[PDB]
């Protein structure tokens, strides 16, 4: 039943809200990347494992940019021959008629006829 999954996700999000409130922040963006809020504790003086998790607690300072994605929309790509075709066979898309086109193909043009 879908309400089961909805209740699961609601509880799982409320727990994160409780924890973030107990910590002292008001959003998940404020805590992403802040590795220095984590410490390593030992299981005790009777197991004697020398695990050191510091290789994953090392903090690389970002610099000017933030510590997360800060751009909207996908990363754009160059434009192939297809564009010209879309600019030429407009009667097909508005009028609903046959067409016939002739161009010159070069090996530097990838995926000819996919956008159409």
């Amino acid at each position: 039943t879908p309400e089961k999954v909805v209740n699961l996700f609601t509880f799982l999000a409320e727990e994160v809200r409780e924890i973030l409130a107990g910590l002292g922040f008001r959003s998940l963006n404020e805590v992403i990347g802040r590795t220095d809020l984590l410490h390593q504790v030992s299981r005790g003086a009777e197991h004697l494992d020398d695990l050191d998790l510091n290789p994953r607690l090392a903090q690389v300072d970002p610099g000017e940019n933030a510590r997360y994605c800060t751009l909207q929309g996908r990363n754009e790509v160059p434009d192939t021959l297809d564009a010209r075709i879309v600019a030429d066979a407009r009667p097909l898309f508005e009028e609903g008629e046959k067409m016939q086109l002739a161009y010159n193909a070069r090996n530097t043009q990838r995926a000819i006829g996919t956008r159409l």
Partner: protein, 117 residues
């Protein structure tokens, strides 16, 4: 035309060779056609002039595509009183397929042809 008379523009060899090049759809035949027609003694004013440039040739793949050049050709007007409906319709359909312009000429046109097939 008579073999004893003068020369003409459109004659048997060139017409047959043009129809063959157009029907079989092969380019070398069309170059044979152009080679035949561009070799007779001068017959019009534009036969005496000569092209002559001073730059260096550039490859064939660099010039405009056939599309933007074909959109510069149109078909003149030919009335429906002279031509038959089938030929007129054939011209109108062929010229719209490549993106160029056609012409209806005098004599009006069929209203029922006003919607795409």
């Amino acid at each position: 035309f008579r073999k004893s008379g003068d020369r003409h523009g459109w004659e048997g060899g060139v017409i047959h060779t043009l129809q063959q090049a157009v029907t079989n759809d092969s380019y070398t035949t069309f170059k044979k056609y152009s080679e035949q027609v561009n070799k007779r003694p001068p017959m019009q004013l534009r036969d005496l002039l000569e092209l002559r440039s001073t730059k260096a040739p550039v490859p064939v793949d660099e010039v405009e595509s056939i599309t933007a050049i074909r959109k510069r050709f149109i078909t003149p007007g030919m009335s429906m009183g002279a031509l038959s409906p089938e030929a007129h319709g054939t011209l109108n359909v062929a010229m719209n397929r490549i993106g160029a312009k056609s012409d209806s000429g005098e004599g009006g046109e069929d209203p029922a042809r006003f919607r795409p097939d």
